[model samples]
Target: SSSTKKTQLQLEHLLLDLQMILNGINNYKNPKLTRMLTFKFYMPKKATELKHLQCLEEELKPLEEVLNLAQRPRDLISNINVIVLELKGSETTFMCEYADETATIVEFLNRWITFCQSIISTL
Candidate 1:
């Protein structure tokens, strides 16, 4: 129960952080670091259930627009690369190199945190 409690807290932190980052984006601030910072807080569990995965996928749908906006600017490539390397800890990291694909992954994570927060809020 303690582990579950901690996980719930972490999930809440991530959701609030993500919402703040989205606010920054709306104000024309490119907070790509928020995307990377999210990974520092959580990673997908190997045994995550289908319903949870589905909820995560649904929540991530909004992130596609964010990724598309970033991809249009070639100047952001280096920043993206750096963030990916730092979070993923390998040069072979897929999220850094491929803009579109990476966006989808990030979006999924965003959704996951959102789902987790929803669950926590109910308790």
Candidate 2:
């Protein structure tokens, strides 16, 4: 809720992923929040902004494995709309799945952020 509302982070790329993941997780409470999340990449080029999306592209998947090309793009790439996964109850909603996934994703994201930072430091 914080990131979607009042997001202030020096690490904006990580914050962006964190925010989107949180949005999907919370949407389980309110399904109406379910909607296509379009992640717009600028027309101009830069590695920092582009790199973040590339890292995300490697892991993030759309709502389902099906859907083909019209449904959703498999890769985050330069720009794409996030098709959020709607986790149902009894199994997916439990703390085990959500908790573990969040921790792992966030941890991986942090490493990516730091790796990107290495480039900035050299500059």
Candidate 3:
């Protein structure tokens, strides 16, 4: 764990991040929106079961579609050291480790932030 910052995003941050990116942005399409004061973030233990591994694949669908996924990537959560994902509509593939470091997770968030900017700027 790097003493830099924690590895999880609180519900408020996620909500704000999503809103800032998606608000006034739905040019037509279906999407999801939510705001919860306290959201429970789940991090599968380093030694997790198959269900845990399967969680992420399902979890990212809405975000991917909203990002305009040209083609969704394969399952991203595994026992692997690094979690690398490339959203279909995105031109970049971001990675992060599942260790004591939150780089990968934070990077994911940052990428979404950037993705929002990318879309908004085009509008």
Candidate 4:
């Protein structure tokens, strides 16, 4: 019971950290895009441990895709507008915009990857 309780506390704290990152994205205002940039961010689920883990797996798809595509040798192209997180009717969506810099995009996606793996590691 004690170990489970400790794990529970850590998981909740991780969720809070994840939420902050998501909010950081949501609140970001891309200065380069003259037109109104539209992006969708899905909040992670927090139900049963197994359920949330599954959900997190699904959520990582688009993020990793963006990361990989940006890693292509296409050079620094500002035209690379990516990501549309398709989720079922469960969690609320947060509107956001992505930065144009390839390194910036990769860093952002990597942060997500890192956090996701951290929780998965904890589990």
The model with the greatest lDDT is 1
TM values, all candidates: 0.35, 0.27, 0.23, 0.35
| Model 3 / residue 40 / CA error / Å | 24
Model 4 clashing residue pairs (backbone): none
Per-residue lDDT of 45-99 in model 1, one digit per residue for the tens? 4313223332232223334445454433233333333322332234341221111
| Worst 10 contiguous positions by lDDT, candidate 1 | 93-102
Off by over 4 Å in 2: 1-56, 62-103
Q: What overall lDDT, based on C-alpha atoms, would model 4 receive against the true structure?
A: 0.39
Local distance difference test, per candidate?
A: 0.41, 0.33, 0.32, 0.39
The true-versus-predicted C-alpha distance at residue 47 of model 2, in Å, is 14
Model 3 lDDT per residue over 1-123, tens place: 421122122222333544543443434234322221122222322312212322333335543443444221223222111221221212433332234422233344444444434433433
lDDT of 2 by residue, 2-93 (tens): 53222123234444544554444443333322322222211112234323334343344532221132232345322222311210112232
Off by over 4 Å in 4: 30-49, 64-123
Give candidate 3 regions above 4 Å deviation.
1-9, 26-57, 69-123
Backbone clashes in model 3: 1
Ranking by lDDT: 1, 4, 2, 3
